[PDB]
Amino acid sequence: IVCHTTATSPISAVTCPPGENLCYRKMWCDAFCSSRGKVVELGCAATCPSKKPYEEVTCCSTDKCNPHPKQRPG
């Protein structure tokens, strides 16, 4: 499948190799929950591991399923 990543410079989406089928989106307010806040992470994953009350990650089983919460539509 294909998931969205935020490791590179800009945000893009690739096809996870023969290992990961699910995507993930991490969120946690960076010391600016008022201004900046919830840090947005992007990446692929095979399964949905645990998650702390703060640094949580939403895993899904679909393509381009882990887009930025405030990503521009189009």
């Binding site: 935020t6 410079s9 800009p10 945000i11 991490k26 969120m27 307010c29 960076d30 600016f32 201004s35 900046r36 806040g37 919830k38 840090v39 947005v40 992470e41 992007l42 930025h68 919460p69 405030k70 990503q71 521009r72």
Partner: peptide, 13 residues
Amino acid sequence: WRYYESSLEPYPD
């Protein structure tokens, strides 16, 4: 580095 919810730009640390 990653991005914050307040924007879509890259954010280093």
